[PDB]
């Protein structure tokens, strides 16, 4: 099937002991390199929150509800990063634009002190 | 007394990672967040292997870093942790070793040009 691609936006089961526990299925962005995304059992993701619609700290990237088929105008939290078993990935909502992915890269560099 | 010395990028802490624990981890988040944020970002350290197996791995030797055995930093295994989960500071990485972690983190996260 279609490879998980860096920059894709997925619904992901973040519920601890996920199975089908609660409403812990939230949008995330794939930030892992595409070689791991193709062969690894795991991916690395950044959280997306609708709790805010405006960047509050330098690790935030805003994303529009309409273009990216979200339930709210949201923010990518590059300070909230986690490695995820691929079995926790549900549906693929969309993918970020190349310009939007560049904002994510820059915020990732800030977040992890990579300059 | 809880040491007010600030958490720094490259520090090696013992951390409570349950659930998927207490294991060593490397702080990889920027030092401004490390000073003020409720959370840090860490990469896992494992003694299950003693040699880099994939390009996201960085080896660290037991004696230099006060480890129970030769270990590997897994830059494919990243997690954001509440600071409460950090226990004791074990040690911190050399400048060259940290440069290797940066490189493996750029590979892991697809940031290299």
């Amino acid at each position: 099937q279609d490879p998980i691609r860096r920059g894709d936006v997925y619904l992901a089961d973040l519920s601890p002991v996920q199975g089908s526990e609660q409403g812990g299925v939230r949008p995330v962005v794939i930030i892992q390199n595409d070689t791991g995304n193709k062969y690894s059992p795991t991916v690395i993701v950044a959280a997306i929150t609708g709790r805010i619609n405006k960047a509050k700290i330098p690790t935030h990237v805003e994303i529009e509800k309409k273009k990216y088929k979200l339930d709210k105008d949201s923010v990518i939290l590059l300070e909230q990063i986690r490695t995820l078993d691929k079995k926790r990935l549900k549906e693929k909502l969309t993918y970020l634009s190349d310009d939007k992915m560049k904002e994510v890269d820059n915020a990732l560099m800030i977040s992890l002190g990579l300059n | 007394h809880h040491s007010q010395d600030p958490i720094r990028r490259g520090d090696v802490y013992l951390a409570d990672l349950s659930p998927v624990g207490v294991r060593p981890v490397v702080i990889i988040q920027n030092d401004t967040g490390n000073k003020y944020s409720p959370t840090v970002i860490v990469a896992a350290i494992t003694g299950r292997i003693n040699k880099a197996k994939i390009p996201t791995h960085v080896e660290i030797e037991k004696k230099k870093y006060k480890l129970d055995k030769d270990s590997v930093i897994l830059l494919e295994q990243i997690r954001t942790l509440d600071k409460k989960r950090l226990k004791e500071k074990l040690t911190y990485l050399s400048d060259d070793k940290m440069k290797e972690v940066d490189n493996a983190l750029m590979i892991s996260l697809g940031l290299n040009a």
Partner: nanobody
Amino acid sequence: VQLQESGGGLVQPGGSLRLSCAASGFTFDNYAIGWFRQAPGKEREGVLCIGSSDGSTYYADSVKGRFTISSDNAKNTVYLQMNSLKPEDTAVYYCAADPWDSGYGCYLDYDYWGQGTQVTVSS
């Protein structure tokens, strides 16, 4: 040996071989497994490699659709099914295995390496 390859030989372009990889003292259960080949004068290359069974198999570009891997139920043997062999495939083939199966692709390092078996494609 602890890993021994077999099942290689000569075959004409288009033929098939099934390389064996026998484990002694341990089973392949939850092991990363890699098949590698080394041509004359060229550096050893990864051909088909499995890290985690929850990940995906890596194939060298030339070998996808021709080479597949399988186990021996008892998991004491691993097989490289090599179909549609081309002269480019002439080399010594190795199997390798590692207890750490949380990775993917062909590992930079494997704890256990076989001795090698010769494969030649020509007619």
